[PDB]
């Protein structure tokens, strides 16, 4: 385990304050808002990651070694309410005025010194940095095009950073005449063994989605063995790409110090009063008069069936897998070359041929020791990149949980009554008029949004609490505006009785 370090580097040149002739906010405004959004999400998520905000090309310089035109607004530290409040002072057109007043802009910088300060910022962290990452927000496709020396020194220092283990990711912004990687950023950025690059960002939603993709390093939920046969065993990593985000658990404090209180739940005897050993305890189940006694080992021994891992059963065509047989949220299977070498090759061959034949790999999934198995279907998932070339669907297998005979519940038999084609045609018109585009990120959890809005407001000890509006509620009035006559006409045709 370890704490991740993330540094946000923002360009503050004249071009950054230009709304590059579109209705979207200037790249500087886009950057500041994106940074703020990441900070809040990092507070919401259960991650210890350390964040930092560094500006370059500013007249006022504030940094460790006093390099000209480098302002380190925030050092590498935990996300805070106060930090987001500081970022809010630069958000917007009103925030842009505040930025130009607090610190200058459009000053001659030196990317070599900029990366030098950033690296020196990771130097000053004491806890083990699992991943070191710098995200450069800029709209200048060829910086130091005029200065040859500054450009070569920057290329050299970028190489020194990659050799250290620091990741360099470009957040290229709207540039008149497009943004060119070949001019600059092509050699500096840290690339991948498996290759090329997302396209230039024009909307904040696109920047945030690209930022959030490389935001946190892939964290495998479990590393299991996928046994094709007793002798053919490849290693796979199970990742939870969707996981229900819940309200953080409360912390028990003290009325005066307001420091955390540790809870020690001790189990002891009634007759004696002293702490009881686990060997002296047994498990019981009483059926009527009979009492069945089992040891803790026996209660776990009965749970025992397969060893942890995935056991390939065979290949079932996707048509047989029904959409209504969902039990628990699906997982993502990706190979793990780190444990068994040659896994990725067989995994790739299996994925390609499964997609070609439109068939899923049926397995007997046992996540941990002494756990009963469950049949899962590894559905071949093809890679999808959006127009910004951000990976919307990673390539691999979706672990679809299949229910047992016990999980399928009996249904209450009702008589089939079919509607006339006129009523269906009218409902078709209603559907066609209320048609809309569904996005996975279309809605925000109102309970969480309200909880963290409340904590933010209590956190500034002055803010009244921030009322999150439930996005899950329908635009009633907009829908009534969209369909006025149709609703009453259909209501008269389908609902003729009064009641």
């Amino acid at each position: 385990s370890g704490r991740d370090s993330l540094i946000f580097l923002v360009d503050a040149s004249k071009a950054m304050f230009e709304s590059q002739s579109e209705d979207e906010l200037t790249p500087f405004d886009m950057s500041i808002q994106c940074i703020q959004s990441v900070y809040i999400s990092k507070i919401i998520s259960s991650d210890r990651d350390l964040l930092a905000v560094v500006f370059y090309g500013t007249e006022k310089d504030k940094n460790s070694v006093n390099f000209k035109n480098i302002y380190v607004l925030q050092e590498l530290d935990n996300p805070g309410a106060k930090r987001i409040l500081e970022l809010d002072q630069f958000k917007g057109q009103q925030g842009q005025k505040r930025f130009q007043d607090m610190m200058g802009h459009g000053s001659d910088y030196s990317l070599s010194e900029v990366l030098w300060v950033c690296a020196n910022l990771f130097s000053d962290v004491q806890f083990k940095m699992s991943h070191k990452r710098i995200m450069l927000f800029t709209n200048e496709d060829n910086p130091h095009g005029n200065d040859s020396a500054k450009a070569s020194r920057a290329r050299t220092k970028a190489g020194d950073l990659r050799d250290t283990g620091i990741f360099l990711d470009l957040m290229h912004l709207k540039k008149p005449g497009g943004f060119d990687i070949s001019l600059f950023y092509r050699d500096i950025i840290s690339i991948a063994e498996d290759e090329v690059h997302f396209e230039e960002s024009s909307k904040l939603e696109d920047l945030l989605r690209k930022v959030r993709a490389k935001e946190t390093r892939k964290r495998a939920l479990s590393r299991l063995k996928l046994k094709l046969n007793k002798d053919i065993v490849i290693s796979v990593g199970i990742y939870n790409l969707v996981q229900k985000a819940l309200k953080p658990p409360p912390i028990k404090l003290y009325r005066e110090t307001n420091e955390p209180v540790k809870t020690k739940t001790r189990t002891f005897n009634t007759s004696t009063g002293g702490l009881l050993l686990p060997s002296d305890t047994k498990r019981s189940q009483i059926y009527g008069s009979r009492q069945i006694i089992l040891e803790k080992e026996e209660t776990e021994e009965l749970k025992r069936f397969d060893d942890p891992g995935l056991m390939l059963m065979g290949f079932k065509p996707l048509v047989l897998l029904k959409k209504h047989h969902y039990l628990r949220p699906s997982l993502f299977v990706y190979p793990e070359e780190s444990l068994v070498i040659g896994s990725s090759t067989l995994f790739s061959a299996l994925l390609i041929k499964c997609l070609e034949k439109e068939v899923a790999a049926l397995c007997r999934y046992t996540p941990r020791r002494n756990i009963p198995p469950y049949f899962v279907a590894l559905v071949p998932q093809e890679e999808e990149l959006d127009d910004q070339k951000i990976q919307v669907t990673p390539p691999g297998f979706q672990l679809v949980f299949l229910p047992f005979a016990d999980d399928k519940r009996k249904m209450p038999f009702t008589e089939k009554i079919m509607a006339t084609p006129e009523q269906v045609g009218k409902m078709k018109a209603i559907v066609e008029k209320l048609r809309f585009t569904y996005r996975s990120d279309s809605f925000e959890n109102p309970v969480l949004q309200q909880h963290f809005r409340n904590l933010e407001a209590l956190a500034l000890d002055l803010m009244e609490p921030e009322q999150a509006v439930d996005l899950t509620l329908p635009k009633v009035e907009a829908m009534n505006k969209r369909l006025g006559s149709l609703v009453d006409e259909f209501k008269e045709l389908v609902y003729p009785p009064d009641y």
Binding site: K82, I251, R255, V261, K408, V431, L434, S440, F443, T472
Partner: protein
């Protein structure tokens, strides 16, 4: 939901005749009966179970006029099953040497139901016959048997060692999928008995009555044995709001819901064996540098907001927290089927939204939406909450039309916070991991050889329907619980072979896969990580 079940087991000599590799139909039927009774015993459902054995050495029966229905013993009268009955099945009941008329035994079972059900005690009446049909029989009272079954409203279920279905369609592992009965084991006498069994089932439940005749093997890997005594699912009403004036009152139930352990393991003392002697006390000590005991009253509630720790008492929380607008099924909108991908499904249940019972206008109003979404290939994005206290959900509502029923299927979808975005390395163009044409043609032969589907009929037959197989957790738990109740000195028994046989794919798939697996082993290199 109560029900009188009488299990009519053939214990005749022919049940003892065993065919090589296959457990004798007597042991097979015994395994099935034990499977049924174990579930009925440990979940403590009020259905009463009686046991009649036909082909016994002796005669213990209420119908004995003119030495009729001889060698039939009512071992257990209709009453709540207990551990003594399970112990008797396990070892006390032994196979007999005579043969009886299975229809005569059915009449004995009917007399049990007719007399022990007085006072409308049972909601459902059910008889389960376990025989091999190798015994000769008389067709004399068949017309009366059918009449008494209908007038008494008693349903039947037959269990044979071989199945009829693959008989008409044309090694051995019990509970396995596929080769679970010798095609060469049915006799002309068994065929004759089968034709009468078929006719009787059709006379009682129509054309679909034939689906209630199972083989012992498949009966072990299904829950069909409880089908007739299964308790109806609890449904609940709400209103599906498609907009103003367009809202439809519906009644939904949980279509899929993970069946979990009913009984809980109570912690007791090894000597006294009572939980009461064990007591759990909570102690508070400081989490910080110092571990001083913290007073339970002075403890105040707090929540973390990143680095800062803000004290927020439960009193203010209830007031400041998000107040849900109430339980509803309001439709947010409609989108194409392609936009909703199964990978985004969330929650731990699937809801089947049916039209409110005894409501014609709502039944048509819902049918119209179902067919409109089906014909247009569209779905409905809705907002759901079971109660005003429950947290709001956002999910998919798609049409689901079959010949008998019509309904909408709700599955919860994710919130922005729930979604997780990671970047995985591409494989389509991984220069380092791209497989050779021979490697791909080897996986091609493997997938073709290991196919779990069979498509004359030109219809696709699933050879490994997992949704029909019961969760091994339960029958394994019942096995161990009974073994400890009857043999306390002996340690826990191993997993019964039929459970492994029912969990593994059909022998034909395993045999077919042997050759391509050996070719891919050599073609696909596997090596352990050490350095």
């Amino acid at each position: 939901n109560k029900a009188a079940v009488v299990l009519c087991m053939d214990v005749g000599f022919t049940m003892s005749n065993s065919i090589p590799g296959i457990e004798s139909p007597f042991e097979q039927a015994k395994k099935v009966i034990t499977m049924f009774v174990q579930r009925q015993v440990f979940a403590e459902n009020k259905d009463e179970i009686a046991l009649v054995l036909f082909g016994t050495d002796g005669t213990d029966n209420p119908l004995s006029g003119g030495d009729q229905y001889q060698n039939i013993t009512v071992h257990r009268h209709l009453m709540l099953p207990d551990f003594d009955l399970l112990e008797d099945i396990e070892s006390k009941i032994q196979p007999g040497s005579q043969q009886a008329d299975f229809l005569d035994a059915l009449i004995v079972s009917m007399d049990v139901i007719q007399h022990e059900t007085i006072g409308k005690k049972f909601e459902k009446r059910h008889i389960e016959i376990f025989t091999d049909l190798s015994s000769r029989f008389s067709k004399s009272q068949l017309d009366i048997i059918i009449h008494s079954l209908k007038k008494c409203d008693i349903s039947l279920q037959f269990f044979l060692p071989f199945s009829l279905g693959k008989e008409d369609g044309s090694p051995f592992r019990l509970g396995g999928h596929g080769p679970s009965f010798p095609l060469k084991g049915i006799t002309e006498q068994q065929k004759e008995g089968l034709e009468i069994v078929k006719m009787v089932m059709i006379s009682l439940e129509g054309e679909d009555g034939l689906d209630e005749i199972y083989s012992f093997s498949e009966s072990l890997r299904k829950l069909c044995v409880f089908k007739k005594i299964e308790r109806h699912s609890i449904h609940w009403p709400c209103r599906l709001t498609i907009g103003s004036n367009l809202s439809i009152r519906i009644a939904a139930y949980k279509s899929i819901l993970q069946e979990r352990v009913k009984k809980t393991w109570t912690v007791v003392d090894a000597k006294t064996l009572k939980k009461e002697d064990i007591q759990k006390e909570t102690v508070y000590c400081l989490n910080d540098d110092d571990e001083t005991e913290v007073l339970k009253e002075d403890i105040i509630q707090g929540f973390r907001y990143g680095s800062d720790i803000v004290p927020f008492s439960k009193v203010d929380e209830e007031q400041m927290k998000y107040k849900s607008e109430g339980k509803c099924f309001s439709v947010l909108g409609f989108c194409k089927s392609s936009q909703v991908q199964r990978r985004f499904f969330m929650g731990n249940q699937v809801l089947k939204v049916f039209a409110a019972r005894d409501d014609e206008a709502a039944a048509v109003a819902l049918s119209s939406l179902i067919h409109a979404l089906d014909d247009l290939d569209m779905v409905a994005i809705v907002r759901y909450a079971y109660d005003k206290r429950a947290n709001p959900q956002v999910g998919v509502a798609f049409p689901h039309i079959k010949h008998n029923y019509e309904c909408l299927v709700y599955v919860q979808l994710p919130f922005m916070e729930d979604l997780r975005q990671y970047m995985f390395s591409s494989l389509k163009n991984s220069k380092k991991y791209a497989p050779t044409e021979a490697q791909l043609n080897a996986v091609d032969a493997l997938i073709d050889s290991m196919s779990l589907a069979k498509k004359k009929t030109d219809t696709l037959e699933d050879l490994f329907p997992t949704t029909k197989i019961p969760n091994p957790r339960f029958q394994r738990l019942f096995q161990c619980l009974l073994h400890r109740a009857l043999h306390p000195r002996e340690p826990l028994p191993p997993i019964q072979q039929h459970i492994w046989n029912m969990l593994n794919p059909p022998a034909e798939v395993t045999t077919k896969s042997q050759i391509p697996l050996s070719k891919i082993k050599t073609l696909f290199p596997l090596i352990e990580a050490k350095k």
